């Protein structure tokens, strides 16, 4: 667009060092006399802080003396003393000054943790202090004399410096002396010099400070500042309306010490200028400048002096610092944000009759919340004369004003936000309905998302006064605008319990029902058929329902069908919107189905049809809920007397096992688990008791003997509707409750035999007592941590905004279904569902592209993905997104609180936080293959030996289950030297252990057949003769490397494979000798002469998941025993035995030689020293380091491992947060990058990755060929992300003010008010969302043209 | 009443810029600067602006035209 | 049920008088703030933590404003925000927004 001639908004903000001359630009008057008293009579003396000549009119266009009591007089001054009459309100902006007669330094920039002035002049802060406290003289403009320019000279020594050098020599102390030094700083000479020596100095204590100084010096260049601008000659003065002085009843003063400090700043100040006209000696008038700078300190707090108190009163004087900021940032942007206007805080109530788009609000609250509108409306129409006359009408609550109240309520959007709201799903918009009551009524089918129940949930009502807020209501916050969860595309509101049962008793089938068999030509008369009740609600009746189908692209072709259907579901159709198929409502109703029904109604029919349909459901949900009269009392429950029959069985066995212990067969622990198992199986029998009983035991005479129908038990209905019927709870209620945990965290082997319906004893209570305790404790604390969890999430992604569409990258990461263990859990589909395809993807069929590069993958395209057998597809990731400081839509997707294209203006950082932080409260041998498919041996080198056992000789044993389709269903990692019953390309059934191994043995087997000769393996040197007491067959048990011999710790037990000649049989593929080294603690299953088959035993070696681990995931803690990965591709070997560490010399065969690691060998090393490993093979065993996989294999590698690691965490938690939210989170973690190569920046400086991304973008381009510094992605923790805040106004908020203030103040680095938290502090529209195009206007008018 | 705003998405689907634009139009309706063209159904200005955008008669294009049109009317 | 939107505020701080006693307005918390940042409510968040009940004079500049019914304001300053500029003014940095 075009910049306007009009002055609309105040543009993006700047902040940088200025000139005291520009402070003279605020020359309204000079503050002289602080005392505003006649020095007796309390006469309000002008000529000071409170003056009209120095500042302005006491009142609007009002002169000091009163010569101008005309609010027409503007400009004309009081000719006695210049009183230019203007509005007194502007005195909240009256800036004055005082011409100091003193060059003053800055002790604040001195004692700041980071000695700013020290690293500024490159002079030890120690000597700098000796200079500013006026105890010694610094040499100025001399330098090439007795001493150097950056040195001091005490009083005694300066006298010596004079006796030797009066010639070409001067050296004063303090600010004036340093003014000379700042007046002479040689910035860029030093710049050339500091990089020269950045390549010269090669010591840590040296170049550390080198890169330090060089950095900030070119930073001064970055702004163009010349150090002089820190030495104040001018003293700025605040607007009068910023320091109160009020009389106290009696004859005293209740003044805020703001005055009593500026008075001090000036008492001392004028005394100083006096002391200079008097020309007093140095150290005395300089001790005066000490008091001048402490006056400055008196304004901050007192700087870092000693907490200056006042005469006979302990009181560290008025701290401006703390008074604009404070805690949690400031006292507005903190929990301290006052009790909002246009608000109403009270508890809530239901309200069935409350329509979809509306809520119910109390008349009384309505009065208190709509007055101004009524006042403006009463004097607008003419039913009140003045606003005060309007007050009187509402003073009596005239029926008239209620109609005017009506006018300002009819279509007035309202915002509803609860207090316990931690996630955005607690904020919506509605429409008012006049309610005569006290509690705020709410629409039922929304409360589930609110998690707002009926106990004491107080919702605050916030009036959208401006049309913008009103439009925001009916734009994104409307009730009908918050249908899906912004974590996953499902229509979040699923019928909870009451409404579910309503529709459950509606659509249901049975065998006996009045009228079962007749025919109707319409569901409409079917309505008038049951509302009368001339037939039962579950009779199979032929009614002609006209189901529809969007056979076209919007034209729903009609298909009239006849259905022998139950009366209830027939009535259900009159509610069902056309397009939806009758097949979805031809079931016995399921809760999962009932939610995804609206999801498919959203897919097929769209938004509108789904919305209005949902409301219809709610009204009939209550309707037929009442028709059910679904009651349950003592006499309606049923208990199997087969329950106490299974208990009889359960009795026998345990009695006998305790008696086995009385003799001494099973041990205590053996008996322990034994007991547990039989009682658990007993409960499953009690299950197969009460479950089948209450499943279909009701048989009714109908068209035959007695045809059974599914039992209409209320319990059964809840248990099948899905509403609230959880057969597990129910079965601890009607069947044996079971074994409850114990105070230890284990299990009391005693079950709660006597069920709830029946008796319970004090014994059973105390078992379950730990349970009660347990529950409470955990949630009561998880709550608090979840809040700080979301705190750290906001911490990490504040500034991320989607602000582009397509960029220029043809990259992302590989999306793959988490095929692990048995069943294929997360599909390829449900990950990519709602994302944008990266590349042109081919089909399992070759050279036939099914999904072109840039394609929005939705339901149908995902159905398209599942028509063939495509298993792996790449999607453009946001961590690979080439968008600089932001994300593009073609790298994000569409899965949001809607199903459409993510738009520019969507600040995604924080919405990710909430969506992901929400689940905090819900956090905590011989494998037979059960999946029926084809056993596919991938990359594993197995071999057939004697007995046909397909033994394993490689660690990468990835077993796959390539099915009839080809898509892997099951995956199993088989250990070393294990048996494989079947091979690659041979189908097996479900229930055969082909993945058969022994966890107690890791046999060392050969690959080919050959003899074994024990080389350097004699008893006493390397091996011991541990031919046991059970097995006398020759075995040479290898002693480990510490039990062998002194000089035996350099001798290796090598097994040499030779034939009947003495020749060595080489290893398949290379020319290397097959010299397998028998490891430590190995039960050698062979002697000298035993021919090892193609895989026979030669040696025998035996051996949180919730908030906690995920928290450490955020700080990326290097573990206890970190599993190290193979650094480079190539051979690995040993060197230098245990001296504490051990040389793991990994020498490349295709890389660079010198690589060798230091590892303590207290770990179990699985080092394949005979093999040529690859960069990534686990070396030791234990937890891993995100860091390492990031810096080694790459971001993409580590990134999807962790998001899939956590994908398993939340998998068993039962929650599905959007992985795309998680993707952006991780990019922000690696926000900074520690550079590796040298170029135009630093050799190792941890700098912005995207800034460096634009660096190389134009390093490849012009002004260079290729000098560009190539970085290494640095992984930062969350308290490091919050520590690396570019918004100093944000770090200062919760971190050390002084620190961060000076931290940016050195160069006065401009925060263009570009971001999020800056828009909080200033109170303006962020550059996104509503203010997106708003700031387009603003940015087009700032720092550019 | 209004069931959805998906029809506003059919014309101007920014979801946020919508808020900005029509809101300013509603304010010219407040201050006697102007008056509506689409008859209100007791709907106060917020809901009226919604109707105007869904039909697509008064969108961002037309509003800027109105801006420059007033410029010829105030200048001359 | 304690409804408070308009009334009188304390003197020691801009914090309203009362709590769950006389005048029960919503003591808006830091985390509900974050909910409004999960939404597009930026302009409403603006007036929320400023013009509503935080700016000692901005609240009156809105009361006398809506007694006219005009919902249209300019980008005003949090005034203490204006004192924060004077904070840096007495140190080394300074505010002189150019152009």
């Amino acid at each position: 667009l075009k910049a306007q001639t009009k002055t609309e908004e105040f543009d993006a903000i700047k902040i940088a060092l200025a000139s005291p001359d520009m402070i003279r630009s605020w020359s309204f008057g000079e503050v002289k006399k602080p005392e505003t008293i006649n020095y007796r009579t309390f006469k309000p003396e002008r000529d000071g802080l409170f003056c009209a000549r120095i500042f302005g009119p006491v009142k609007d266009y009002e002169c000091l003396c009163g010569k101008y009591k005309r609010l027409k007089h503007r400009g004309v001054i009081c000719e006695k003393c210049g009183v230019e009459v203007t509005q007194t309100k502007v005195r909240r902006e009256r800036m004055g000054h005082i011409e100091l007669a003193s060059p003053t330094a800055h002790i604040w920039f001195l004692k700041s943790l980071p000695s700013r002035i020290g690293l500024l002049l490159d002079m030890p802060l120690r000597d700098i202090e000796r200079v500013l406290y006026f105890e010694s003289y610094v040499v100025i403009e001399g330098g090439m004399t007795n001493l150097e320019r950056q040195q001091i000279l005490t009083e005694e020594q300066y006298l010596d410096a004079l006796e030797e050098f009066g010639d070409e020599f001067d050296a004063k102390m303090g600010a004036e002396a340093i003014q000379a030094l700042l007046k002479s700083m040689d910035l860029e000479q030093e710049c050339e010099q500091l990089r020269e020596e950045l390549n010269e100095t090669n010591s840590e204590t040296k170049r550390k400070k080198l890169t330090k100084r060089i950095k900030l010096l070119e930073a001064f260049v970055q702004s163009g500042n010349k150090p002089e601008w820190m030495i104040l000659t001018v003293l700025p003065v605040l607007p009068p309306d910023l320091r109160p002085l009020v009389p106290l009843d009696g004859g005293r003063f209740a003044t805020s010490d703001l005055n009593d400090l500026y008075r001090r700043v000036i008492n001392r100040n004028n005394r100083l200028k006096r002391l200079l006209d008097l020309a007093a000696p140095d150290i005395i008038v300089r001790n005066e400048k000490r008091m001048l700078q402490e006056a400055v300190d008196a304004l901050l707090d007192n700087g870092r002096r000693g907490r200056a108190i006042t005469g006979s009163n302990k009181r560290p004087l008025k701290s401006l610092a703390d008074m604009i900021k404070g805690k949690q940032g400031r006292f507005r942007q903190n929990l301290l944000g006052k009790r909002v206007d246009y608000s109403g805080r009270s508890v809530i109530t239901v309200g069935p009759y409350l329509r979809l788009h509306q809520c119910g609000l109390p008349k009384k609250m309505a009065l208190e919340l709509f007055k101004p509108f009524i006042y403006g409306k009463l004097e607008l129409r003419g039913l009140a004369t003045t606003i005060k006359a309007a007050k009187k009408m509402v003073e009596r609550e005239e029926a008239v004003v209620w109609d005017i109240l009506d006018e300002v309520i009819r279509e007035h959007p309202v915002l509803l936000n609860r207090a316990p709201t931690l996630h955005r799903l607690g904020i919506q918009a509605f429409e008012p309905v006049l309610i005569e009551g006290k509690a705020i009524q709410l629409h039922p089918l929304v409360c589930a998302a609110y998690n707002a129940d009926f106990d004491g949930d107080q919702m605050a009502v916030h009036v959208p006064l401006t049309l913008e807020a009103q439009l925001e209501a009916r734009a994104l916050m409307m009730s009908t605008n918050n249908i899906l969860s912004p974590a996953n595309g499902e229509p979040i509101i699923v019928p909870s319990q009451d409404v579910v049962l309503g529709l459950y008793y509606m659509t249901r089938d049975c065998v006996n029902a009045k009228g079962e068999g007749m025919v109707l030509t319409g569901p409409k008369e079917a309505e008038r058929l049951y509302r009368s009740g001339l037939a039962s609600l579950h009779a199979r009746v032929k009614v002609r329902i006209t189901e529809y189908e969007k056979d076209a692209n919007g034209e729903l072709v009609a298909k009239t069908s006849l259905k022998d259907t139950t009366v209830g579901r027939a009535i259900l159709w009159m509610i069902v919107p056309k397009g939806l198929p009758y097949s979805i409502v031809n079931q016995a109703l399921g809760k999962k189905a009932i939610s995804k029904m609206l999801n498919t109604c959203y897919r097929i029919l769209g938004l509108k049809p789904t919305v209005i349909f949902a409301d219809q459901i709610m009204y009939t949900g209550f309707a037929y809920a009442a028709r059910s009269g679904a009651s349950v009392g003592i006499d309606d429950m049923v208990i199997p007397e087969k329950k106490h029959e299974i208990i009889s069985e359960a009795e026998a066995e345990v009695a006998e096992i305790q008696e086995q212990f009385q003799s001494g067969l099973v041990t205590a622990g053996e008996r322990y688990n034994k007991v547990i198992d039989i009682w658990a199986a007993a409960n499953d029998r009690v299950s197969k008791a009460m479950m089948d009983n209450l499943q279909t035991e009701t048989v009714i005479n109908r068209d035959g003997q007695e045809e059974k129908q599914v039992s209409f038990n209320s319990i059964y209905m809840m248990a099948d509707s899905g509403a609230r019927g959880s057969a597990a709870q129910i079965r601890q209620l009607a069947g044996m409750r079971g074994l409850m945990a114990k105070p230890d965290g284990s299990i009391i082997e005693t079950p709660i035999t006597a069920n709830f319906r029946e008796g319970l004893n004090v014994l059973q209570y105390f078992i379950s007592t730990h349970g009660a305790r347990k529950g409470l404790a955990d949630t009561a604390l998880k709550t608090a941590n979840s809040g700080y969890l979301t705190r750290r999430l906001v911490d990490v992604a504040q500034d991320l905004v989607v602000t582009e569409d397509d960029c220029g990258t043809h990259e992302g990461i590989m999306m793959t279904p988490v095929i692990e263990g048995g069943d294929v859990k997360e599909p390829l589909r449900d990950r990519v569902l709602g994302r944008v395809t990266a590349e042109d993807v081919l089909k399992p069929g070759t050279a036939d592209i099914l999904v072109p590069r840039n394609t929005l993958l939705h339901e149908q395209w995902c159905d398209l993905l599942e028509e063939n057998s495509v298993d792996a597809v790449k999607v453009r990731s946001v961590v690979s997104c080439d968008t600089d400081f932001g994300v593009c839509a073609h790298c994000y997707g569409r899965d949001l609180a809607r199903g459409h294209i993510i738009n520019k203006g969507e600040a995604i950082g924080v919405i990710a936080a909430q969506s992901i932080g929400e689940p905090g409260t819900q956090l905590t041998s011989s494998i037979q293959v059960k999946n029926k498919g084809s056993i596919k041996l991938s990359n594993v080198k197995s071999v057939v030996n004697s007995s046909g056992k397909l033994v394993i000789t490689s660690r990468n044993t990835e077993l796959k289950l390539i099915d009839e389709f080809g898509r892997t269903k099951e995956s199993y990692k088989v250990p070393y030297g294990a048996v494989l019953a079947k091979g690659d390309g041979e189908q097996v059934a479900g229930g055969e252990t082909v993945a058969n191994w022994d966890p107690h043995t890791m046999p060392v087997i050969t690959e080919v057949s050959g003899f074994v000769r024990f080389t350097d393996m004699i008893d006493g040197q390397t091996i011991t003769r541990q031919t046991d007491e059970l097995t006398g067959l020759s075995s040479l048990v290898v002693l480990d490397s510490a039990e062998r011999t002194a000089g035996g710790k350099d001798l290796r037990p090598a097994l040499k494979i030779v034939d009947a000649q003495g020749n060595d049989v080489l290893i398949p593929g290379t020319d290397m000798p097959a010299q397998y080294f028998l490891p430590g603690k190995a039960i050698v299953q062979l002697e000298d002469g035993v021919q090892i088959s193609s895989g026979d035993t030669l040696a025998r070696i035996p051996q949180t998941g919730g908030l906690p681990r995920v928290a450490d995931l955020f700080e990326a803690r290097r573990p206890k025993e970190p599993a190290i990965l193979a650094e480079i591709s190539g051979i690995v070997s040993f060197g230098k035995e245990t001296k504490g560490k051990r040389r793991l010399v990994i020498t490349p065969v295709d890389g660079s030689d010198p690589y060798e690691e230091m590892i303590p060998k207290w770990r179990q090393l699985n080092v394949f020293e005979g093999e040529r490993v690859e960069r990534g093979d686990v070396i030791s065993d234990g937890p891993e380091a995100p860091h390492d996989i990031l810096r080694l294999r790459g971001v993409h590698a580590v990134t999807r491992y962790i998001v899939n690691e956590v994908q398993d965490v939340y998998r068993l938690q039962g929650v599905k947060i959007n992985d795309k939210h998680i993707e952006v989170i991780v990019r922000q973690m690696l926000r900074k990058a520690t550079i590796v190569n040298a170029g135009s920046s630093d050799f190792l400086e941890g700098e912005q990755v995207e800034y460096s991304r634009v660096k190389i973008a134009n390093r490849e381009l012009e002004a260079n060929g290729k000098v560009g510094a190539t970085y290494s992605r640095d992984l930062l923790g969350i308290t490091k992300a919050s520590l690396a805040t570019e918004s100093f106004i944000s770090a200062a908020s919760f971190q050390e003010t002084t620190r961060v203030l000076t931290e940016a103040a050195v160069a006065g680095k401009r925060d263009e008010l570009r971001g999020l938290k800056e828009n909080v502090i200033v109170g303006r529209l962020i550059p996104a969302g509503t203010g997106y195009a708003y700031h387009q206007d603003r940015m087009r008018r700032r720092a550019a043209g | 009443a209004r069931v959805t705003v998906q029809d506003a998405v059919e014309k101007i689907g920014n979801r946020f810029d919508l808020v900005l634009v029509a809101a300013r139009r509603a304010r010219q309706m407040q201050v006697g600067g102007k008056d509506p063209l689409v008859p209100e159904e007791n709907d106060k200005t917020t809901v009226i602006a919604l109707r105007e955008i869904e039909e697509g008669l008064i969108n961002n294009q037309i509003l800027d035209v109105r801006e420059r049109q007033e410029q010829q009317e105030q200048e001359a | 049920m304690h409804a408070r939107s308009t009334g009188s505020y304390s003197l020691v701080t801009q914090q309203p008088l009362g709590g769950k006693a006389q005048f029960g307005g919503q003591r808006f918390g830091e985390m509900e703030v974050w909910a409004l940042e999960a939404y597009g409510a930026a302009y409403t968040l603006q007036e929320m933590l400023t013009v509503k009940s935080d700016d000692v004079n901005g609240r009156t500049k809105m009361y006398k404003n809506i007694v006219d019914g005009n919902h249209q304001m300019e980008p005003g300053m949090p005034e203490s925000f204006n004192v924060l500029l004077k904070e840096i003014r007495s140190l080394g940095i300074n505010i002189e927004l150019e152009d």
Side-chain angles (χ1 to χ4, degrees), chain A residues 251-262:
Chain A
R252 297 176 299 184
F253 299 111
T255 175
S256 293
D257 307 307
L258 292 169
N259 287 304
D260 295 304
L261 284 177
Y262 283 110

PDB file of all heavy atoms in Angstrom, chain A residues 251-262:
ATOM      1  N   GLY A 251      -0.814  20.162  59.369  1.00  0.00           N
ATOM      2  CA  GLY A 251       0.288  21.070  59.101  1.00  0.00           C
ATOM      3  C   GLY A 251       1.573  20.373  58.690  1.00  0.00           C
ATOM      4  O   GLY A 251       2.663  20.922  58.866  1.00  0.00           O
ATOM      5  N   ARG A 252       1.450  19.166  58.143  1.00  0.00           N
ATOM      6  CA  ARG A 252       2.611  18.395  57.706  1.00  0.00           C
ATOM      7  C   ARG A 252       2.524  18.044  56.221  1.00  0.00           C
ATOM      8  O   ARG A 252       1.684  18.588  55.500  1.00  0.00           O
ATOM      9  CB  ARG A 252       2.739  17.120  58.546  1.00  0.00           C
ATOM     10  CG  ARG A 252       2.997  17.384  60.025  1.00  0.00           C
ATOM     11  CD  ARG A 252       3.016  16.097  60.833  1.00  0.00           C
ATOM     12  NE  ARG A 252       1.738  15.393  60.768  1.00  0.00           N
ATOM     13  CZ  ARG A 252       1.461  14.280  61.441  1.00  0.00           C
ATOM     14  NH1 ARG A 252       2.373  13.740  62.238  1.00  0.00           N
ATOM     15  NH2 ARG A 252       0.271  13.707  61.319  1.00  0.00           N
ATOM     16  N   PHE A 253       3.385  17.136  55.767  1.00  0.00           N
ATOM     17  CA  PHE A 253       3.406  16.746  54.358  1.00  0.00           C
ATOM     18  C   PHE A 253       3.447  15.236  54.116  1.00  0.00           C
ATOM     19  O   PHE A 253       4.263  14.524  54.699  1.00  0.00           O
ATOM     20  CB  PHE A 253       4.606  17.405  53.664  1.00  0.00           C
ATOM     21  CG  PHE A 253       4.568  18.909  53.689  1.00  0.00           C
ATOM     22  CD1 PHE A 253       5.481  19.632  54.456  1.00  0.00           C
ATOM     23  CD2 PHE A 253       3.604  19.604  52.965  1.00  0.00           C
ATOM     24  CE1 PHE A 253       5.431  21.026  54.501  1.00  0.00           C
ATOM     25  CE2 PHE A 253       3.544  20.997  53.002  1.00  0.00           C
ATOM     26  CZ  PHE A 253       4.461  21.710  53.773  1.00  0.00           C
ATOM     27  N   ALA A 254       2.555  14.762  53.249  1.00  0.00           N
ATOM     28  CA  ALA A 254       2.487  13.348  52.893  1.00  0.00           C
ATOM     29  C   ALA A 254       3.083  13.214  51.491  1.00  0.00           C
ATOM     30  O   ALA A 254       2.414  12.760  50.564  1.00  0.00           O
ATOM     31  CB  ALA A 254       1.034  12.877  52.891  1.00  0.00           C
ATOM     32  N   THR A 255       4.345  13.610  51.342  1.00  0.00           N
ATOM     33  CA  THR A 255       5.018  13.570  50.046  1.00  0.00           C
ATOM     34  C   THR A 255       5.784  12.288  49.727  1.00  0.00           C
ATOM     35  O   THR A 255       6.362  11.657  50.614  1.00  0.00           O
ATOM     36  CB  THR A 255       5.999  14.757  49.907  1.00  0.00           C
ATOM     37  OG1 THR A 255       6.723  14.637  48.677  1.00  0.00           O
ATOM     38  CG2 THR A 255       6.985  14.776  51.067  1.00  0.00           C
ATOM     39  N   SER A 256       5.775  11.913  48.449  1.00  0.00           N
ATOM     40  CA  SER A 256       6.493  10.735  47.979  1.00  0.00           C
ATOM     41  C   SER A 256       7.913  11.224  47.731  1.00  0.00           C
ATOM     42  O   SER A 256       8.122  12.199  47.004  1.00  0.00           O
ATOM     43  CB  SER A 256       5.869  10.204  46.682  1.00  0.00           C
ATOM     44  OG  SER A 256       4.570   9.690  46.916  1.00  0.00           O
ATOM     45  N   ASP A 257       8.877  10.544  48.345  1.00  0.00           N
ATOM     46  CA  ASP A 257      10.289  10.902  48.258  1.00  0.00           C
ATOM     47  C   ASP A 257      10.881  11.134  46.866  1.00  0.00           C
ATOM     48  O   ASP A 257      12.097  11.263  46.734  1.00  0.00           O
ATOM     49  CB  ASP A 257      11.140   9.859  48.991  1.00  0.00           C
ATOM     50  CG  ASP A 257      10.674   9.615  50.416  1.00  0.00           C
ATOM     51  OD1 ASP A 257      10.541  10.585  51.195  1.00  0.00           O
ATOM     52  OD2 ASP A 257      10.445   8.438  50.762  1.00  0.00           O
ATOM     53  N   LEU A 258      10.047  11.173  45.831  1.00  0.00           N
ATOM     54  CA  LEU A 258      10.562  11.429  44.490  1.00  0.00           C
ATOM     55  C   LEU A 258      11.162  12.837  44.568  1.00  0.00           C
ATOM     56  O   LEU A 258      12.275  13.088  44.109  1.00  0.00           O
ATOM     57  CB  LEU A 258       9.422  11.380  43.460  1.00  0.00           C
ATOM     58  CG  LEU A 258       8.757  10.018  43.203  1.00  0.00           C
ATOM     59  CD1 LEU A 258       7.491  10.208  42.380  1.00  0.00           C
ATOM     60  CD2 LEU A 258       9.728   9.089  42.484  1.00  0.00           C
ATOM     61  N   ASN A 259      10.404  13.740  45.186  1.00  0.00           N
ATOM     62  CA  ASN A 259      10.809  15.130  45.374  1.00  0.00           C
ATOM     63  C   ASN A 259      12.062  15.247  46.248  1.00  0.00           C
ATOM     64  O   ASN A 259      12.996  15.983  45.915  1.00  0.00           O
ATOM     65  CB  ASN A 259       9.667  15.927  46.022  1.00  0.00           C
ATOM     66  CG  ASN A 259       8.522  16.209  45.060  1.00  0.00           C
ATOM     67  OD1 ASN A 259       8.723  16.794  43.996  1.00  0.00           O
ATOM     68  ND2 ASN A 259       7.313  15.802  45.436  1.00  0.00           N
ATOM     69  N   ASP A 260      12.073  14.510  47.359  1.00  0.00           N
ATOM     70  CA  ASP A 260      13.183  14.516  48.312  1.00  0.00           C
ATOM     71  C   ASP A 260      14.462  13.855  47.803  1.00  0.00           C
ATOM     72  O   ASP A 260      15.407  13.638  48.560  1.00  0.00           O
ATOM     73  CB  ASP A 260      12.748  13.848  49.622  1.00  0.00           C
ATOM     74  CG  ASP A 260      11.655  14.621  50.333  1.00  0.00           C
ATOM     75  OD1 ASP A 260      11.866  15.816  50.624  1.00  0.00           O
ATOM     76  OD2 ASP A 260      10.587  14.034  50.605  1.00  0.00           O
ATOM     77  N   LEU A 261      14.486  13.521  46.521  1.00  0.00           N
ATOM     78  CA  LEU A 261      15.667  12.915  45.920  1.00  0.00           C
ATOM     79  C   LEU A 261      16.156  13.808  44.797  1.00  0.00           C
ATOM     80  O   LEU A 261      17.362  13.977  44.605  1.00  0.00           O
ATOM     81  CB  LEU A 261      15.356  11.518  45.380  1.00  0.00           C
ATOM     82  CG  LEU A 261      15.239  10.434  46.453  1.00  0.00           C
ATOM     83  CD1 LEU A 261      14.868   9.100  45.829  1.00  0.00           C
ATOM     84  CD2 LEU A 261      16.565  10.323  47.185  1.00  0.00           C
ATOM     85  N   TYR A 262      15.210  14.377  44.057  1.00  0.00           N
ATOM     86  CA  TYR A 262      15.545  15.283  42.971  1.00  0.00           C
ATOM     87  C   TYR A 262      15.975  16.595  43.613  1.00  0.00           C
ATOM     88  O   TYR A 262      16.753  17.353  43.038  1.00  0.00           O
ATOM     89  CB  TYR A 262      14.336  15.484  42.054  1.00  0.00           C
ATOM     90  CG  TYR A 262      14.111  14.310  41.129  1.00  0.00           C
ATOM     91  CD1 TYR A 262      13.022  13.453  41.300  1.00  0.00           C
ATOM     92  CD2 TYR A 262      15.034  14.008  40.129  1.00  0.00           C
ATOM     93  CE1 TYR A 262      12.868  12.317  40.502  1.00  0.00           C
ATOM     94  CE2 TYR A 262      14.891  12.879  39.328  1.00  0.00           C
ATOM     95  CZ  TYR A 262      13.812  12.037  39.522  1.00  0.00           C
ATOM     96  OH  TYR A 262      13.695  10.898  38.758  1.00  0.00           O
TER      97      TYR A 262
END
